[PDB]
Design a protein around this nucleic acid. Sequence first.
RNA 1: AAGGUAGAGUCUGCGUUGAACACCAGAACAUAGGCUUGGAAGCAGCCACUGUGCUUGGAAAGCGUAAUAGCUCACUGGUCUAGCAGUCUCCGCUUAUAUAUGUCCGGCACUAUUGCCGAAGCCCGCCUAUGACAAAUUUUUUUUUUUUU
Length: 152
Amino acid sequence: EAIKHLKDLQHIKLEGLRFRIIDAKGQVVGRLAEQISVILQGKDKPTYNPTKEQGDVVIVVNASHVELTHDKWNTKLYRWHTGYPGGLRSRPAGDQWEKDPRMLLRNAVSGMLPKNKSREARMEKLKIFPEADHPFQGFPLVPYVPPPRRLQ
RNA sequence: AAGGUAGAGUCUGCGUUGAACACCAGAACAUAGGCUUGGAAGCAGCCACUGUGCUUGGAAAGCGUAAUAGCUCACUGGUCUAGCAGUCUCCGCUUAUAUAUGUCCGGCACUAUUGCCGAAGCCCGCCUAUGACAAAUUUUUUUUUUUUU
Ligand SMILES: [Mg+2]
Ligand SMILES: [Mg+2]
Ligand SMILES: [Mg+2]
């Protein structure tokens, strides 16, 4: 992590926004992805404009405390094509965790954003970290705790 | 149509006088019950279903042998000891072989007789065209019958 703490501090995006930190301990990937999508679009702001791309810098820690309920570790797949004949590639969720474990929440947030050309800028602002610390230690960052889970 | 697919709605064959499965297993005599066949010995084809001491043992579901047997299932005392079925009814997902370029819930995801959103409907403001209906208390305002031989 000698240079990984350096590269994540290199910012391409606009920075008039607010930084958010979310602990993903015990959170279901779908509901956390819904809340992260709402924060990323900037619709938690009274000054929201559909044309203007505001939002928040969402930082997620503990990406491997994230669970997939009802045997979706072996049955949920991730499929794409290569453009070549026979190019269907389907990866299971356990193999997706064993390849890159932050991609579960990454793809879940990607499927919930609006499908336009502002999606690249919104997916920049989602920074998902597997372990419990992030490079933005000294930053002024405001925590987003979700509403309590016990509706059931 | 089909499987120990599950969640719920009633009477009941079981069953705390030792219980389905799980455990020690008693598991038989005149006999090899009567025809055939070389042998038909609990059972190739078939006919019979005599008794017996019985808490139990079917002429007997069977691997099986020239067949007895090598083994046992079913029927019953106790062990385990609170176990406990299969008859009726739906439901959220299933099974029945080519989506044969590349995913078939739209994707991502998830194990309310009314509050709100929601249309060019309806109401409100303004405008246009064509139709109707409504509205918009002092009359009189002067001017001629005639005349000249
Ligand atoms: Mg109305
Ligand atoms: Mg109207
Ligand atoms: Mg008019």
